[PDB]
Amino acid sequence: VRPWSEFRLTPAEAAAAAALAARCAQRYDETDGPEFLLDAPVIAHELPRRLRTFMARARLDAWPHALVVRGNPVDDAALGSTPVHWRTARTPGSRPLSFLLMLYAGLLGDVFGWATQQDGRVVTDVLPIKGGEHTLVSSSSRQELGWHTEDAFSPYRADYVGLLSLRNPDGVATTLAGVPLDDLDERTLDVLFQERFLIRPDDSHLQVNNSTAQQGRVEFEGIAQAADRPEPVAILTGHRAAPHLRVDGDFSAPAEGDEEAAAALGTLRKLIDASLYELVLDQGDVAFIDNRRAVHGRRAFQPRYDGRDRWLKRINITRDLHRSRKAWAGDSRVLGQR
Amino acid sequence: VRPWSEFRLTPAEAAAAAALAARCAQRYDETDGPEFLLDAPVIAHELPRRLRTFMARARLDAWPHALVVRGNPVDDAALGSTPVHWRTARTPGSRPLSFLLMLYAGLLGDVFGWATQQDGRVVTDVLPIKGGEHTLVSSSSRQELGWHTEDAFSPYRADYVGLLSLRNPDGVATTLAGVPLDDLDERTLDVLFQERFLIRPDDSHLQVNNSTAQQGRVEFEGIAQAADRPEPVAILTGHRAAPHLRVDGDFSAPAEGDEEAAAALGTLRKLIDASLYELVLDQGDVAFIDNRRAVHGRRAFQPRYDGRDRWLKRINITRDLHRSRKAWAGDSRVLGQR
Ligand SMILES: N=C(N)NCC[C@H](O)[C@H](N)C(=O)O
Ligand SMILES: N=C(N)NCC[C@H](O)[C@H](N)C(=O)O
Ligand SMILES: [Fe+2]
Numbered sequence: 069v070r071p072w073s074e075f076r077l078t079p080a081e082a083a084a085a086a087a088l089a090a091r092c093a094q095r096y097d098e099t100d101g102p103e104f105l106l107d108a109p110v111i112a113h114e115l116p117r118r119l120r121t122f123m124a125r126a127r128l129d130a131w132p133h134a135l136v137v138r139g140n141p142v143d144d145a146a147l148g149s150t151p152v153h154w155r156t157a158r159t160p161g162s163r164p165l166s167f168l169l170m171l172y173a174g175l176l177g178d179v180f181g182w183a184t185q186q187d188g189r190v191v192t193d194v195l196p197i198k199g200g201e202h203t204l205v206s207s208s209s210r211q212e213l214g215w216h217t218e219d220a221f222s223p224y225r226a227d228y229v230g231l232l233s234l235r236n237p238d239g240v241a242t243t244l245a246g247v248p249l250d251d252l253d254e255r256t257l258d259v260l261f262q263e264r265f266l267i268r269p270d271d272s273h274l275q276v277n278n279s280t281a282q283q284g285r286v287e288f289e290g291i292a293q294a295a296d297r298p299e300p301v302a303i304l305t306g307h308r309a310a311p312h313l314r315v316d317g318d319f320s321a322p323a324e325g326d327e328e329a330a331a332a333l334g335t336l337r338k339l340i341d342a343s344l345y346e347l348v349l350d351q352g353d354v355a356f357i358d359n360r361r362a363v364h365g366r367r368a369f370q371p372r373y374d375g376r377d378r379w380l381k382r383i384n385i386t387r388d389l390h391r392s393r394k395a396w397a398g399d400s401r402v403l404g405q406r
Numbered sequence: 407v408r409p410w411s412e413f414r415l416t417p418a419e420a421a422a423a424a425a426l427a428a429r430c431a432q433r434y435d436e437t438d439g440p441e442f443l444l445d446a447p448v449i450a451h452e453l454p455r456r457l458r459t460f461m462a463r464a465r466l467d468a469w470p471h472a473l474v475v476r477g478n479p480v481d482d483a484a485l486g487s488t489p490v491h492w493r494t495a496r497t498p499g500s501r502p503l504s505f506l507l508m509l510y511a512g513l514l515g516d517v518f519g520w521a522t523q524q525d526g527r528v529v530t531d532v533l534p535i536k537g538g539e540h541t542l543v544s545s546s547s548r549q550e551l552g553w554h555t556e557d558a559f560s561p562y563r564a565d566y567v568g569l570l571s572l573r574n575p576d577g578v579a580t581t582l583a584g585v586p587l588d589d590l591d592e593r594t595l596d597v598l599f600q601e602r603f604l605i606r607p608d609d610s611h612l613q614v615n616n617s618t619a620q621q622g623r624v625e626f627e628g629i630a631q632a633a634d635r636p637e638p639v640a641i642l643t644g645h646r647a648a649p650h651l652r653v654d655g656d657f658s659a660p661a662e663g664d665e666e667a668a669a670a671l672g673t674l675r676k677l678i679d680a681s682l683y684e685l686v687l688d689q690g691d692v693a694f695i696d697n698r699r700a701v702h703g704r705r706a707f708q709p710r711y712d713g714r715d716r717w718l719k720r721i722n723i724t725r726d727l728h729r730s731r732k733a734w735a736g737d738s739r740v741l742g743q744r
């Protein structure tokens with residue numbers, strides 16, 4: 069079997085999808101502009117019907133950890149070299165594919181960004197940055213990006229995480245793991261369902277990993293409060309036979325002086341490590357990871373820094389934007405609190 | 407101003423929408439069948455673009471209590487007489503309009519029903535039943551249907567409640583009320599945000615208001631547990647400047663021996679009563695009430711029982727079906743627990 073739901077575009081379907089994305093890139097100024105954010109869900113209705121059928125059905129299935137779409141053509145010559153930093157990563161060559169990702173994302177829910185991550189951008193970049201190979205963020209390389217729920221600290225975290233591979237010549241794998249329900253005993257399961265765990269915000273929300281001012285953007289103050297004074301939360305929620313998962317390998321901890329909770333988390337680490345599997349996003353592959361069913365990461369790899377490094381576009385998706393209205397910065401689609 | 411977001415179909419747009427609904431009625435056996443439940447969201451993409459644009463945008467606005475669509479043609483001759491009971495309310499005349507409601511609903515989210523209400527039907531009926539004029543359910547008439555959040559007792563309650571008026575010759579009004587935030591003092595507001603209120607399941611989930619067996623459908627046992635042993639919950643949730651509302655006028659109460667909570671609920675009753683406004687759903691009008699922003703009801707009216715009584719089709723909608731996977735009866739779209 070495959071733990072994800074997979075769809076392969078025919079050449080005609082992919083060509084049509086790309087043509088629609090090119091139309092949007094031609095007509096709109098940017099993906100994150102208020103105009104295209106509103107229209108993308110409606111424009112996405114013009115995508116190939118077999119893809120729309122897959123996205124509507126696969127989303128409502130109970131089992132898959134991700135929805136994978138293969139076969140989007142990407143011309144390395146037209147794309148150009150991989151950017152050295154995310155700041156300067158909105159290149160004309162990558163523009164149509166950013167619009168394509170937002171169109172696909174529009175079929176699954178409401179796209180949003182974070183005020184404290186990559187300058188409040190909705191469409192974000194994942195690429196290796198020179199100097200930061202051994203960091204705990206997505207711009208790492210030599211150090212493996214440990215498994216985690218995206219923005220695990222926040223209750224306004226995405227339901228789905230979209231990942232479109234612009235290039236990945238050496239086939240570096242995205243890691244994935246579901247809830248290890250076949251190995252979790254009921255006592256450990258009970259404890260994971262209780263609010264006895266501290267999940268702090270990851271390093272992508274730090275001020276150093278955003279541009280120069282930016283800080284002091286008031287939304288960083290809420291990140292500091294989440295890091296300094298994290299309130300206890302549960303790792304598992306909902307149905308015991310198919311729980312939703314909320315955990316971060318490098319930023320989770322038990323409640324202070326709670327050894328029962330600690331033992332449960334320690335056991336969960338072991339079981340997730342042992343059941344971790346690989347998903348290689350080849351050039352043109354799009355993956356929408358179910359952020360509630362699965363944790364994800366990225367394998368360690370040797371960065372090139374020759375202009376052809378692994379490069380993904382990424383986007384956060386929620387099924388309901390009004391869930392996070394407390395975290396609304398303003399009228400924009402950028403979340404964060406004081 | 408109007409507290410809801412309104413859209414009027416042009417004759418051509420309405421005709422096209424009706425034609426699409428007729429196509430679905432011709433091709434599918436029923437609305438609640440597993441086939442059309444999966445396909446309706448995709449088929450809804452073929453609706454008029456101006457309507458799809460309205461539904462995508464109006465859903466993401468912060469202010470409206472409901473999304474109202476006017477101007478769907480309904481032929482009283484083709485429709486036929488109003489049913490005497492919901493059991494026998496799936497008439498051939500009302501069939502195309504039931505498909506139309508599910509197509510509109512498909513643009514807003516995932517439709518579902520309740521195992522303990524109207525025999526697990528997704529598309530339900532609202533009509534006056536002889537003998538039950540002074541009941542606390544939607545089939546009442548002479549007694550006003552008091553304001554409430556739909557299925558307030560359940561955490562799996564709908565995000566939107568769809569209401570399509572098949573006929574309403576005497577213009578009986580649907581009542582609506584938002585959070586009375588202009589009158590709620592901060593102390594009362596604080597208490598409403600705390601888990602100090604008991605919300606029991608309404609009478610539509612009782613065994614007497616469903617068909618003969620049915621009982622003992624195991625899902626009624628969870629309703630009994632919710633009625634007998636309700637666990638404390640908050641009336642208001644989320645953002646203090648725009649809270650989500652969870653209350654039932656006839657089935658809410660404070661926590662036992664909690665007079666502070668009682669006073670807050672008592673005050674809330676007064677403010678909702680004083681700010682209650684009317685929305686008349688004329689023949690062909692569709693209303694998608696925001697179940698989190700507003701409570702709703704129906705004004706008292708004298709029932710006719712002459713074959714032309716007020717008659718609505720109704721449907722529950724959630725932004726995410728996986729939110730209620732604990733309450734999944736099976737593979738079907740019908741909720742309820744043991
Ligand atoms: N959660 C950990 N361990 N690292 C952060 C990875 C996340 O994907 C983060 N949004 C990032 O892009 O760095
Ligand atoms: N909540 C009160 N007061 N009555 C029940 C009305 C609800 O709309 C219920 N689902 C019904 O149809 O009777
Ligand atoms: Fe991530």
Ligand SMILES: [Fe+2]
Nearest residue numbers: 544555556702
């Ligand atoms: Fe109701």
